[PDB]
Amino acid sequence: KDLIKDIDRFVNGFELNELEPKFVMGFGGIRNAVNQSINIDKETNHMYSTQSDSQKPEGFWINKLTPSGDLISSMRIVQGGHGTTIGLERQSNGEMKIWLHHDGVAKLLQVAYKDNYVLDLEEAKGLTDYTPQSLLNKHTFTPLIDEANDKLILRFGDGTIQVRSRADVKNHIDNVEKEMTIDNRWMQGIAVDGDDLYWLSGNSSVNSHVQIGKYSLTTGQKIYDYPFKLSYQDGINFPRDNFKEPEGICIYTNPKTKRKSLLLAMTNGGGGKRFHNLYGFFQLGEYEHFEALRARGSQNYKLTKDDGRALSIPDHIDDLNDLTQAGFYYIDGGTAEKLKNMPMNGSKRIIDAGCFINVYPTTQTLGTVQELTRFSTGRKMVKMVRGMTLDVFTLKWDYGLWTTIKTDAPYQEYLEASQYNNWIAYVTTAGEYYITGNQMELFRDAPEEIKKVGAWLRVSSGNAVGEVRQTLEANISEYKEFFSNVNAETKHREYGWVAKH
Template identity: 25%
Template sequence: MIRLDSAVTPTLLSGATLASQGSVAQSFFWESFDQYWYVCQRDITPADQDRLLVSRLTADGVLVDSMHIERAGHGANIGVERTGGAVFLWTDALPSGGWATGLARIPWQKDATVDASDTTAPASVVTFHRPRTTGAYRVSATIDPNRRQLIYRWQSNDIKSEEGVGGIDRYDLDAVVAGTYTPLATMPFTASGRTLQGYASLGDHLYTYYGKPDKEPGAVTTLTCSDWATGRVVQDVTITAFASLSDREPEGLCVYENSPGDPQATLAFGFSGGSSGARTFQAARYPHPGNGTWTEVPFNTAAFVPNSASYKPQYRLSGDQVFLHFSLDQIDGKAWASTQQLFQLPLRARPNRTQRLVGVVSGAYVTGQPLTVRLEVTADGWVTLYDDRGFKGWIGADVSFWIC
């Protein structure tokens, strides 16, 4: 279970530009194999037709491409499935009154348009799924990537989420794809009085995200954790991240993994910001309380060589900290230069402000001075040397720093 009382919420995206700046994000999903964000918006146009626009972003929030899903619904939640080399979206489908009555499974096709109500379309374009064929309104879905389960929310009354009554089901994802809809568990819910802005499942727990735009009276953003086995709420906390945003509105919740099946998986939650016509998207994550595995970091092998295989640049996440381990020498044997960049950490391991570190050097061509060196890790992840002595030899570090 992810502890939601942590004061540390490292920023993952800030001011990201989506394929349209005319509407807020509704939901999002992190696909850890390719390291892409999929962000779903309602594409508001005069001929809207319940159309959704899904933007695909790099880990750093750079827009790669997008896809239109026509006659879909509200986009309250979205799931992304990776099977083999293919990626599939799980989105709203077959809308009634602007809200989905079914689900569409759609192969990702950049810059394409797919009709999520065209039941005559071939399976290579879209397939439809209705796990509950009767008495289910305002349906939506996401995916628990660690357990490869489809998480399906439905209401028994066609009314806003504050007053909604219904349930959230868990299904084996591959069974659903094959057309078998046998719930593994159902968590019922009653009227909460809160506006649902997203939900995600991670292992034994379901997380629900509530809130309204800051400009609305009584706006409070909260995140709740419930036990799948008992349905009991075990955590319910207030989210204060991105407090300075204009038109701040909570939007979207998903599982955040470093890589597929990551035992250190945690949660990412989103906020929209900016005025109409200039909308942006931002996301933060909760830290995981445990220790991650040591992960190698790419470096310029034409310029640097490690002391040995065990001294290749590596990092490890441990709760709110990043641990760094490396020892490198220059292949050309030249002296080290101040402000020289060694390697760049991935987004998930970067600080949100520059961190100063103390490293060690071999001491070649350095006499009468301490064999230490100053390193800095910049906010964009570059591990950078700051030393004017012009020494030669290896430089190393076994250090840690807060990422908050």
């Protein structure tokens, strides 16, 4: 007897104060401001939210969102009021209509939603009024809808709840089917599911607990108050910037399983940095409905380690040519010293330290780019990129030449003659380097005129025959500059240094 009454409660129960709140997904909105309301369109899985527009007579935005919380479009109700609650009613032709109270014209409206559209005041005046006959000159309410029973509920400032038939209001029929009274801490959201009414309250402080009160529309009295703690960025009651404001609730009934969820919108983050997170209370198995919706819009390919560390290259990779899989990698100096096919300037390995390797998300045919960033703190950071493509018939790779992204720091890119076999001609990678007087003496192809003094070395891009022009500018108080062409591959110098001075 009892074991079944326990299993049925756990499997089929939907008593709010017995359910655990769980994070569902984040969601957006056009405004850099807190959220206000949240609603689900059960026929599409679209989400709709409202936000203030922050204007002299307050208006609000309506945001149309993907099932994963991304912004599709927004609609502004100029001087429409706070937009505390709205009601969704999808029409037969697939167009969405929004039940809202336009405070500017003092009318209950059923507006057609339009993508990235501004509903100015002059248009709102010409729209059809659906305000009930008994509610003229009494415009202190906002509407919401009970989808399961097709009810249009009106919430009044003084705390009056009016349950009406949506079809009745659409047909200009004034009939109040149910009326109850709701009553430091003020209203943050309201949702109605049949006989059950839910009342969200709590302020943004970390010290203010979030609470949902459950009421019965037949009895008219409170069943219970349900305080609860949510897990934020850093855990329970540790939200980013110590801000956690409740911003609306809605009941969702799964069209297929007919089982229920109560969704809760929270805004976290500090001033000018607000972002919105959806939480929920679920019957057994219903969290998966929204997890799948989140997963569809999530990043499902791993770009970094789960703790924010860059990926490490597999142990079996001993050749940069084989690191063709997209991701953000890092290799330490030891690995950079041994990997095959690293960028060279003759005998010198250009990347002579640890290195970030950004392998681009690939083309549709698995082509990609390797972007290397030499990781040092005492020298400039070198950035180089090369591309590569895969032949889908031979399954062999073709690797392109290296492009250098120009970088410079207030410290020298020092050239040690011995590392280049004492050949300036080895340096054919574009960029600016410095040769000290001591090293100039050791370079075999240094210009005699400045054999014992330092100079900046500048290397140009290639010409049509694969040659690059090297320029030496003497680091002295008089103008002395030389140039000479070098073949980038063979390092053969075309002619001796030519003086410009």
